[PDB]
Design an enzyme around this catalytic site. Structure first.
Site, PDB file in Angstrom:
ATOM      1  N   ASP A   1     -59.369 -25.239   5.610  1.00  0.00           N
ATOM      2  CA  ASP A   1     -58.575 -26.198   4.832  1.00  0.00           C
ATOM      3  C   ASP A   1     -59.189 -26.505   3.461  1.00  0.00           C
TER       4      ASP A   1
ATOM      5  N   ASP B   1     -55.918 -26.327  -4.681  1.00  0.00           N
ATOM      6  CA  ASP B   1     -54.782 -27.134  -5.100  1.00  0.00           C
ATOM      7  C   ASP B   1     -55.184 -28.519  -5.596  1.00  0.00           C
TER       8      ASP B   1
ATOM      9  N   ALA C   1     -48.982 -26.003  -6.811  1.00  0.00           N
ATOM     10  CA  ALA C   1     -48.291 -27.025  -6.026  1.00  0.00           C
ATOM     11  C   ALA C   1     -48.997 -27.187  -4.682  1.00  0.00           C
TER      12      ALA C   1
ATOM     13  N   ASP D   1     -49.271 -26.909  -0.850  1.00  0.00           N
ATOM     14  CA  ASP D   1     -48.760 -25.847   0.003  1.00  0.00           C
ATOM     15  C   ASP D   1     -47.653 -26.360   0.925  1.00  0.00           C
TER      16      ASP D   1
ATOM     17  N   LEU E   1     -58.059 -25.803  -0.363  1.00  0.00           N
ATOM     18  CA  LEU E   1     -57.708 -24.415  -0.640  1.00  0.00           C
ATOM     19  C   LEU E   1     -56.216 -24.262  -0.915  1.00  0.00           C
ATOM     20  N   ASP E   2     -55.907 -23.389  -1.870  1.00  0.00           N
ATOM     21  CA  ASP E   2     -54.538 -23.018  -2.222  1.00  0.00           C
ATOM     22  C   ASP E   2     -54.168 -21.750  -1.446  1.00  0.00           C
TER      23      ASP E   2
ATOM     24  N   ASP F   1     -59.565 -24.992  12.703  1.00  0.00           N
ATOM     25  CA  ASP F   1     -59.700 -26.400  12.354  1.00  0.00           C
ATOM     26  C   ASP F   1     -58.554 -26.882  11.460  1.00  0.00           C
TER      27      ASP F   1
ATOM     28  N   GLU G   1     -56.105 -26.715  16.115  1.00  0.00           N
ATOM     29  CA  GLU G   1     -56.177 -28.167  16.257  1.00  0.00           C
ATOM     30  C   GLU G   1     -55.112 -28.802  15.359  1.00  0.00           C
TER      31      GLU G   1
ATOM     32  N   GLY H   1     -54.677 -50.911  34.550  1.00  0.00           N
ATOM     33  CA  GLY H   1     -53.833 -50.620  35.695  1.00  0.00           C
ATOM     34  C   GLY H   1     -52.340 -50.690  35.422  1.00  0.00           C
TER      35      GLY H   1
HETATM   36  C1  LIG Z   1     -51.994 -20.344 -17.865  1.00  0.00           C
HETATM   37  C2  LIG Z   1     -52.706 -19.125 -17.349  1.00  0.00           C
HETATM   38  O1  LIG Z   1     -53.328 -19.469 -16.048  1.00  0.00           O
HETATM   39  C3  LIG Z   1     -53.008 -18.558 -14.890  1.00  0.00           C
HETATM   40  O2  LIG Z   1     -54.059 -18.689 -14.043  1.00  0.00           O
HETATM   41  C4  LIG Z   1     -53.808 -19.313 -12.747  1.00  0.00           C
HETATM   42  C5  LIG Z   1     -52.574 -20.164 -12.582  1.00  0.00           C
HETATM   43  O3  LIG Z   1     -52.439 -21.177 -13.620  1.00  0.00           O
HETATM   44  C6  LIG Z   1     -52.710 -20.853 -11.258  1.00  0.00           C
HETATM   45  O4  LIG Z   1     -51.608 -21.753 -11.011  1.00  0.00           O
HETATM   46  C7  LIG Z   1     -52.842 -19.877 -10.083  1.00  0.00           C
HETATM   47  O5  LIG Z   1     -51.632 -19.274  -9.853  1.00  0.00           O
HETATM   48  C8  LIG Z   1     -51.383 -19.109  -8.433  1.00  0.00           C
HETATM   49  C9  LIG Z   1     -50.544 -20.240  -7.885  1.00  0.00           C
HETATM   50  O6  LIG Z   1     -51.307 -21.480  -7.857  1.00  0.00           O
HETATM   51  C10 LIG Z   1     -50.064 -19.976  -6.496  1.00  0.00           C
HETATM   52  O7  LIG Z   1     -49.130 -21.003  -6.095  1.00  0.00           O
HETATM   53  C11 LIG Z   1     -49.379 -18.626  -6.378  1.00  0.00           C
HETATM   54  O8  LIG Z   1     -48.216 -18.671  -7.084  1.00  0.00           O
HETATM   55  O9  LIG Z   1     -50.237 -17.506  -6.901  1.00  0.00           O
HETATM   56  C12 LIG Z   1     -50.707 -17.749  -8.278  1.00  0.00           C
HETATM   57  C13 LIG Z   1     -51.667 -16.674  -8.655  1.00  0.00           C
HETATM   58  O10 LIG Z   1     -51.102 -15.455  -8.279  1.00  0.00           O
HETATM   59  O11 LIG Z   1     -53.902 -18.829 -10.300  1.00  0.00           O
HETATM   60  C14 LIG Z   1     -53.866 -18.233 -11.658  1.00  0.00           C
HETATM   61  C15 LIG Z   1     -55.085 -17.386 -11.856  1.00  0.00           C
HETATM   62  O12 LIG Z   1     -55.442 -16.787 -10.643  1.00  0.00           O
HETATM   63  C16 LIG Z   1     -52.900 -17.068 -15.206  1.00  0.00           C
HETATM   64  O13 LIG Z   1     -54.196 -16.461 -15.080  1.00  0.00           O
HETATM   65  C17 LIG Z   1     -52.331 -16.733 -16.545  1.00  0.00           C
HETATM   66  O14 LIG Z   1     -51.295 -15.743 -16.302  1.00  0.00           O
HETATM   67  C18 LIG Z   1     -51.777 -17.903 -17.318  1.00  0.00           C
HETATM   68  N1  LIG Z   1     -51.597 -17.464 -18.733  1.00  0.00           N
HETATM   69  C19 LIG Z   1     -50.219 -17.769 -19.167  1.00  0.00           C
HETATM   70  C20 LIG Z   1     -50.254 -18.517 -20.367  1.00  0.00           C
HETATM   71  C21 LIG Z   1     -48.781 -18.831 -20.936  1.00  0.00           C
HETATM   72  C22 LIG Z   1     -48.210 -20.241 -20.768  1.00  0.00           C
HETATM   73  O15 LIG Z   1     -46.913 -20.279 -21.302  1.00  0.00           O
HETATM   74  C23 LIG Z   1     -47.864 -17.720 -20.870  1.00  0.00           C
HETATM   75  O16 LIG Z   1     -47.262 -17.569 -22.139  1.00  0.00           O
HETATM   76  C24 LIG Z   1     -48.581 -16.298 -20.460  1.00  0.00           C
HETATM   77  O17 LIG Z   1     -47.560 -15.286 -20.280  1.00  0.00           O
HETATM   78  C25 LIG Z   1     -49.321 -16.371 -19.299  1.00  0.00           C
HETATM   79  O18 LIG Z   1     -50.211 -15.253 -19.265  1.00  0.00           O
HETATM   80  C1  LIG Z   2     -60.782 -37.687   8.366  1.00  0.00           C
HETATM   81  C2  LIG Z   2     -59.633 -37.326   9.248  1.00  0.00           C
HETATM   82  O1  LIG Z   2     -58.361 -37.427   8.496  1.00  0.00           O
HETATM   83  C3  LIG Z   2     -57.188 -36.841   9.237  1.00  0.00           C
HETATM   84  O2  LIG Z   2     -56.897 -37.600  10.342  1.00  0.00           O
HETATM   85  C4  LIG Z   2     -55.793 -38.472  10.010  1.00  0.00           C
HETATM   86  C5  LIG Z   2     -54.640 -38.112  10.889  1.00  0.00           C
HETATM   87  O3  LIG Z   2     -54.194 -36.766  10.599  1.00  0.00           O
HETATM   88  C6  LIG Z   2     -53.569 -39.128  10.685  1.00  0.00           C
HETATM   89  O4  LIG Z   2     -52.332 -38.676  11.261  1.00  0.00           O
HETATM   90  C7  LIG Z   2     -54.075 -40.398  11.347  1.00  0.00           C
HETATM   91  O5  LIG Z   2     -54.663 -40.037  12.524  1.00  0.00           O
HETATM   92  C8  LIG Z   2     -54.217 -40.716  13.733  1.00  0.00           C
HETATM   93  C9  LIG Z   2     -54.810 -42.086  13.881  1.00  0.00           C
HETATM   94  O6  LIG Z   2     -56.208 -42.129  13.506  1.00  0.00           O
HETATM   95  C10 LIG Z   2     -54.764 -42.448  15.318  1.00  0.00           C
HETATM   96  O7  LIG Z   2     -54.908 -43.877  15.421  1.00  0.00           O
HETATM   97  C11 LIG Z   2     -53.491 -41.963  16.020  1.00  0.00           C
HETATM   98  O8  LIG Z   2     -53.092 -42.890  16.942  1.00  0.00           O
HETATM   99  O9  LIG Z   2     -52.345 -41.642  15.079  1.00  0.00           O
HETATM  100  C12 LIG Z   2     -52.696 -40.755  13.941  1.00  0.00           C
HETATM  101  C13 LIG Z   2     -52.153 -39.400  14.270  1.00  0.00           C
HETATM  102  O10 LIG Z   2     -51.178 -39.507  15.276  1.00  0.00           O
HETATM  103  O11 LIG Z   2     -55.194 -40.931  10.508  1.00  0.00           O
HETATM  104  C14 LIG Z   2     -56.236 -39.942  10.130  1.00  0.00           C
HETATM  105  C15 LIG Z   2     -56.715 -40.352   8.775  1.00  0.00           C
HETATM  106  O12 LIG Z   2     -57.963 -40.939   8.913  1.00  0.00           O
HETATM  107  C16 LIG Z   2     -57.507 -35.425   9.672  1.00  0.00           C
HETATM  108  O13 LIG Z   2     -56.332 -34.865  10.277  1.00  0.00           O
HETATM  109  C17 LIG Z   2     -58.700 -35.422  10.580  1.00  0.00           C
HETATM  110  O14 LIG Z   2     -58.907 -34.053  10.983  1.00  0.00           O
HETATM  111  C18 LIG Z   2     -59.889 -35.926   9.807  1.00  0.00           C
HETATM  112  N1  LIG Z   2     -61.154 -36.042  10.587  1.00  0.00           N
HETATM  113  C19 LIG Z   2     -61.864 -34.749  10.603  1.00  0.00           C
HETATM  114  C20 LIG Z   2     -61.741 -34.002   9.408  1.00  0.00           C
HETATM  115  C21 LIG Z   2     -62.168 -32.493   9.758  1.00  0.00           C
HETATM  116  C22 LIG Z   2     -61.449 -31.321   9.077  1.00  0.00           C
HETATM  117  O15 LIG Z   2     -62.353 -30.337   8.636  1.00  0.00           O
HETATM  118  C23 LIG Z   2     -62.648 -32.424  11.124  1.00  0.00           C
HETATM  119  O16 LIG Z   2     -63.023 -31.131  11.512  1.00  0.00           O
HETATM  120  C24 LIG Z   2     -63.899 -33.469  11.303  1.00  0.00           C
HETATM  121  O17 LIG Z   2     -64.404 -33.315  12.645  1.00  0.00           O
HETATM  122  C25 LIG Z   2     -63.470 -34.771  11.082  1.00  0.00           C
HETATM  123  O18 LIG Z   2     -64.266 -35.389  10.067  1.00  0.00           O
HETATM  124 CA   LIG Z   3     -55.024 -28.279   2.945  1.00  0.00          CA
HETATM  125 CA   LIG Z   4     -50.643 -48.071  36.829  1.00  0.00          CA
HETATM  126 CA   LIG Z   5     -50.751 -24.395  -3.384  1.00  0.00          CA
HETATM  127 CA   LIG Z   6     -53.308 -26.529  -0.412  1.00  0.00          CA
END
Ligand SMILES: C[C@H]1O[C@H](O[C@H]2[C@H](O)[C@@H](O)[C@@H](O[C@H]3[C@H](O)[C@@H](O)[C@@H](O)O[C@@H]3CO)O[C@@H]2CO)[C@H](O)[C@@H](O)[C@@H]1N[C@H]1C=C(CO)[C@@H](O)[C@H](O)[C@H]1O
Ligand SMILES: C[C@H]1O[C@H](O[C@H]2[C@H](O)[C@@H](O)[C@@H](O[C@H]3[C@H](O)[C@@H](O)[C@@H](O)O[C@@H]3CO)O[C@@H]2CO)[C@H](O)[C@@H](O)[C@@H]1N[C@H]1C=C(CO)[C@@H](O)[C@H](O)[C@H]1O
Ligand SMILES: [Ca+2]
Ligand SMILES: [Ca+2]
Ligand SMILES: [Ca+2]
Ligand SMILES: [Ca+2]
Ligand SMILES: C[C@H]1O[C@H](O[C@H]2[C@H](O)[C@@H](O)[C@@H](O[C@H]3[C@H](O)[C@@H](O)[C@@H](O)O[C@@H]3CO)O[C@@H]2CO)[C@H](O)[C@@H](O)[C@@H]1N[C@H]1C=C(CO)[C@@H](O)[C@H](O)[C@H]1O
Ligand SMILES: C[C@H]1O[C@H](O[C@H]2[C@H](O)[C@@H](O)[C@@H](O[C@H]3[C@H](O)[C@@H](O)[C@@H](O)O[C@@H]3CO)O[C@@H]2CO)[C@H](O)[C@@H](O)[C@@H]1N[C@H]1C=C(CO)[C@@H](O)[C@H](O)[C@H]1O
Ligand SMILES: C[C@H]1O[C@H](O[C@H]2[C@H](O)[C@@H](O)[C@@H](O[C@H]3[C@H](O)[C@@H](O)[C@@H](O)O[C@@H]3CO)O[C@@H]2CO)[C@H](O)[C@@H](O)[C@@H]1N[C@H]1C=C(CO)[C@@H](O)[C@H](O)[C@H]1O
Ligand SMILES: C[C@H]1O[C@H](O[C@H]2[C@H](O)[C@@H](O)[C@@H](O[C@H]3[C@H](O)[C@@H](O)[C@@H](O)O[C@@H]3CO)O[C@@H]2CO)[C@H](O)[C@@H](O)[C@@H]1N[C@H]1C=C(CO)[C@@H](O)[C@H](O)[C@H]1O
Length: 482
Positions: A103, A160, A182, A184, A202-203, A232, A262, A301
Site C-alpha cells: 500500500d 499518489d 488521481a 486509485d 503507492l500509485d 496487507d 486482509e 451473556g
Molecule cells: C508533466 C510531465 O510529467 C509526466 O510525468 C509523470 C506524470 O505527471 C504523472 O502523473 C505519472 O503519470 C502516471 C499516472 O499518475 C498514472 O495514473 C497512470 O496514468 O500512468 C502515468 C504514467 O504512465 O508519471 C509520469 C512520469 O512517470 C511525464 O513524464 C511527462 O510526459 C509530462 N510532460 C508533459 C508536459 C506538458 C504539459 O502540457 C505537455 O505539453 C507534454 O506533451 C508532456 O510531455
Molecule cells: C492505522 C489503521 O488505519 C486503518 O484502519 C481504519 C479502518 O480501516 C477504519 O474502517 C476504522 O476501523 C474500524 C474501527 O477501528 C473499529 O472500531 C471497527 O469497529 O470499525 C472500523 C472498520 O469497520 O478505523 C481505522 C482508522 O484508524 C487501516 O485499515 C488499518 O490497517 C490501520 N492499522 C494498520 C495499518 C497497517 C497497514 O500497513 C497494518 O499492517 C498495521 O498492523 C497497523 O498499523
Molecule cells: Ca493505497
Molecule cells: Ca447469550
Molecule cells: Ca493513482
Molecule cells: Ca494510490
C-alpha cells in the site's frame, strides 16, 4: 483427508532482539506435530528502523542483508536466518506465507518538492486547498543495497500522495498533481476513497510501479521458496491490481501460491464486493467473525449465540474464509483494538478449529502470551483443540445453533481416520446440556471431554445421539474414548 491449520507467527510487542527467524527454525517440528500446516510470517524486509514490525516498509529487496536504516538485520533477524526458517518449516512439512506490504512506502532517503493539494480527510475526492509545493518524503535510492537485485529508484511521481509536508511541518492528506494523477480506483469507499492510508502511498495506476512490484514478486518467491502470501491492507489498494499481480507471480514462479488478503471491515457486503471484483483469486480474513467473538465476549451473556455465524465469511464463502480469534492489530493498544476476553477465547478457537468451514489460524500472542500487557499464554487450552482438529474434526457436520446461550455442532468422523468424530458445546452463559446426533456408528461408545473441563462422560444411545454437556461460560469437546 487433512485439516489445514495456519498460525500467525508473530505479535506486535515482540522485543527487537532479532530472534524470531531462529525461533521458527527451532519450533517448526513441535508445531507440525500439533497439526499446524502453514506459518504466516511477518514482513521480512527492511522497515523504517530495526524495531519496525515490518509495515513501515523501506526496502522490499533487503531481507536483513544490507546496512540500511541503521541496521543490517531486521527486527526478526538476518536474511540467512530467514532462509533457514523457511527451510525448517519445509522439512517439518509446513507451508510458509510471507507478509506482502504494497500500500505504501516509508522512511525515504530524502524529500522532493511536489505540487500537491489537500483533500478532505473524511472525503478524499474533495480538494480543500489550492495547489502548492510541498516537501514530501518520496526519494528512495537505497544507499546500502546499491543496484543489487533491482536498480529501480522511487520518486514522488510513483506515489499518489503523502500525509506530511516537511517544509511547513504540516499534517494533512496531500494528493499529488500530475498528468493522470488521481487516487486509485476501485478501493474502499469509507472516507469517499480510502486509497491513502499512511507514509507515501503507492500509485497502482503507474505502469513502472506495477512492473517493479511484479519483478519483486517473482524475485522474492525464487529467492525464498515461500509457498504463498498474506496481502496487507488490500482495501486501500486498487482492487484490480492483485488479480493481475498474482497471476503474474504464480505463472512466472510455477507455484500455486495460496493467498489471503486482509480486507478490514465488519461489513460482509464489502468483503463480498472485493471477492467478486478480484474473481475469487484469493481468500480473505474473516474480520466479521472476529467482531462476533469480541461482541459475544463483552456482552455478559446477552449476546444471541444463534447469530454467531451470521454475516461472516465462514458462513457465506467458507472456502475463501481464513478464520481467527485475534491478531496483532486487535491487540491492546493497537488502532484496531478489539481484544477477545480470555474467558471466551477457548470457545472461539473451538468454533473455528473443530468446524468444517474455513481455514483456521492460531495467533502467536494467544499461544505464547503477550508479556508486554501481562496476558498469560493460552497454549494449555489451545493444544487440546488442535488435537481435536488434527484427529477428530472430520466428516459430516450437524449444526445445533439453536439456543441464545448454548450452541453446538457435531462431526461424524471418517472411516479413513478410525476414532475420529466429535461433539462440541460452547456457552456464553450458564451451562447445560444438549442432545446432538453423532451417528449410529458410535452407539454404545463412551465420549469424554477432550478439553478436560468436565470429568463426566457421555454415552451414545442406540440411535446415535448423545446428551452432551458444558459448564457455564466454557467449552467442552466430546470425543470417543479408546
Ligand atoms: C508533466 C510531465 O510529467 C509526466 O510525468 C509523470 C506524470 O505527471 C504523472 O502523473 C505519472 O503519470 C502516471 C499516472 O499518475 C498514472 O495514473 C497512470 O496514468 O500512468 C502515468 C504514467 O504512465 O508519471 C509520469 C512520469 O512517470 C511525464 O513524464 C511527462 O510526459 C509530462 N510532460 C508533459 C508536459 C506538458 C504539459 O502540457 C505537455 O505539453 C507534454 O506533451 C508532456 O510531455
Ligand atoms: C492505522 C489503521 O488505519 C486503518 O484502519 C481504519 C479502518 O480501516 C477504519 O474502517 C476504522 O476501523 C474500524 C474501527 O477501528 C473499529 O472500531 C471497527 O469497529 O470499525 C472500523 C472498520 O469497520 O478505523 C481505522 C482508522 O484508524 C487501516 O485499515 C488499518 O490497517 C490501520 N492499522 C494498520 C495499518 C497497517 C497497514 O500497513 C497494518 O499492517 C498495521 O498492523 C497497523 O498499523
Ligand atoms: Ca493505497
Ligand atoms: Ca447469550
Ligand atoms: Ca493513482
Ligand atoms: Ca494510490
Ligand atoms: C502442507 C500441505 O500444503 C498443501 O495444502 C495447502 C493447500 O494447497 C492450500 O490451498 C490451502 O488449503 C486451504 C484452502 O486454500 C482453503 O480454500 C480452505 O478451504 O482450507 C484449506 C486448508 O484447510 O492450505 C493447505 C495447507 O494448510 C498441500 O495441498 C498438501 O499436500 C500439504 N500437506 C498434505 C500432504 C499429505 C498427503 O499425503 C498429508 O500429510 C496431508 O493430507 C496434508 O497435510
Ligand atoms: C518524518 C517522517 O514523516 C513521514 O512518516 C510519517 C508518516 O507519513 C505518517 O503517516 C505517520 O505514520 C504513522 C502511521 O500513519 C500510523 O498508522 C502508525 O501505524 O505508523 C506511523 C507511526 O508514526 O508518521 C510517520 C513519521 O512521522 C515520512 O514518510 C517519513 O519517511 C519521514 N521520516 C524521515 C525522517 C528521519 C529523520 O531525519 C529519518 O530517520 C527517516 O529515514 C526519514 O525517512
Ligand atoms: C448465571 C451463571 O452464569 C455464570 O457465569 C458465566 C456467565 O454466564 C458468562 O457470561 C461468562 O461470564 C463472564 C462475563 O461475561 C464477563 O463480563 C466477565 O465478567 O467474566 C465472566 C467470566 O469470568 O462466564 C461465566 C462463567 O464463568 C456461571 O455459569 C454460573 O456460575 C452463574 N450462576 C452463578 C451466579 C452466582 C450467584 O448467583 C454465583 O455465586 C453461583 O456460582 C452461581 O449461582
Ligand atoms: C458424587 C458426585 O459426583 C458427580 O459429579 C460429577 C458431575 O457430573 C459434575 O460435577 C462434573 O462436572 C464438573 C466438572 O468436572 C468440573 O471441572 C467443574 O468445574 O464443573 C462441572 C460441574 O458442573 O464432575 C463430577 C465428576 O463426575 C455427580 O454428577 C454428582 O451428582 C455427585 N453428587 C454430588 C452432587 C450434589 C449437588 O447437590 C451434592 O448434593 C452431593 O452430595 C454430591 O455427592
Amino acid at each position: 483427508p487433512f485439516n489445514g491449520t495456519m498460525m500467525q507467527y508473530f505479535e506486535w510487542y515482540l522485543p527487537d532482539d532479532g530472534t524470531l527467524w531462529t525461533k521458527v527454525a527451532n519450533e517448526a517440528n513441535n508445531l507440525s506435530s500439533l497439526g499446524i500446516t502453514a506459518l504466516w510470517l511477518p514482513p521480512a524486509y527492511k522497515g523504517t528502523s530495526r524495531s519496525d514490525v515490518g509495515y513501515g516498509v523501506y526496502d522490499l529487496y533487503d531481507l536483513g542483508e544490507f546496512n540500511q536504516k541503521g541496521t543490517v538485520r531486521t527486527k526478526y533477524g538476518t536474511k540467512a536466518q530467514y532462509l533457514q526458517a523457511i527451510q525448517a518449516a519445509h522439512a517439518a512439512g509446513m507451508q510458509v506465507y510471507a507478509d506482502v506490504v504494497f500500500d505504501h512506502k516509508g522512511g525515504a532517503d530524502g524529500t522532493e518538492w511536489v505540487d500537491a493539494v489537500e483533500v478532505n480527510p473524511s472525503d478524499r475526492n474533495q480538494e480543500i486547498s489550492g495547489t502548492y509545493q510541498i516537501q514530501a518524503w518520496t526519494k528512495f535510492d537505497f544507499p546500502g543495497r546499491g543496484n543489487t537485485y533491482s536498480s529501480f529508484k522511487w520518486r514522488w511521481y510513483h506515489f499518489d500522495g503523502v500525509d506530511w509536508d516537511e517544509s511547513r511541518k504540516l499534517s494533512r492528506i496531500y494528493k499529488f498533481r500530475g498528468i493522470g494523477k488521481a487516487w486509485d480506483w476501485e478501493v474502499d469507499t469509507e472516507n469517499g476513497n480510502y486509497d491513502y492510508l499512511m507514509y507515501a502511498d503507492l500509485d497502482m495506476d503507474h505502469p513502472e510501479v506495477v512492473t517493479e512490484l511484479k519483478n519483486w514478486g517473482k524475485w522474492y518467491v525464487n529467492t525464498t521458496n515461500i509457498d504463498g502470501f498474506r496481502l496487507d491492507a488490500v482495501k486501500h489498494i486498487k482492487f484490480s491490481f492483485f488479480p493481475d499481480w498474482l497471476s503474474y507471480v504464480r505463472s512466472q514462479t510455477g507455484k500455486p501460491l495460496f493467498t489471503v488478503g486482509e480486507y478490514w471491515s465488519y461489513d460482509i457486503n464489502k468483503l463480498h464486493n472485493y471477492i467478486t471484483k478480484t474473481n475469487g483469486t484469493m481468500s480473505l480474513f474473516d474480520a466479521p467473525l472476529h467482531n462476533k467473538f469480541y461482541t459475544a465476549s463483552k456482552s455478559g451473556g446477552a449476546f444471541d449465540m444463534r447469530t454467531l455465524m451470521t454475516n461472516t465469511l465462514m458462513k457465506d464463502q467458507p472456502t475463501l474464509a481464513v478464520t481467527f480469534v485475534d491478531n496483532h492489530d486487535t491487540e491492546p493498544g493497537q488502532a484496531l483494538q478489539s481484544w477477545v476476553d480470555p474467558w471466551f477465547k477457548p470457545l472461539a478457537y473451538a468454533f473455528i478449529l473443530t468446524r468444517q468451514e474455513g481455514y483456521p489460524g492460531v495467533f502467536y500472542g494467544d499461544y505464547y502470551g503477550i508479556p508486554q500487557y501481562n496476558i498469560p499464554s493460552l497454549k494449555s487450552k489451545i493444544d487440546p483443540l488442535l488435537i481435536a482438529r488434527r484427529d477428530y474434526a472430520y466428516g459430516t457436520q450437524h449444526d445445533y445453533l439453536d439456543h441464545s446461550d448454548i450452541i453446538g455442532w457435531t462431526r461424524e468422523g471418517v472411516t479413513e481416520k478410525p476414532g475420529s468424530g466429535l461433539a462440541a458445546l460452547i456457552t456464553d452463559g450458564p451451562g447445560g446440556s444438549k442432545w446432538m446426533y453423532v451417528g449410529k456408528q458410535h452407539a454404545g461408545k463412551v465420549f469424554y471431554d477432550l478439553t478436560g473441563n468436565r470429568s463426566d462422560t457421555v454415552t451414545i444411545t442406540s440411535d446415535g445421539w448423545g446428551e452432551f454437556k458444558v459448564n457455564g461460560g466454557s467449552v467442552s469437546v466430546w470425543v470417543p474414548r479408546k
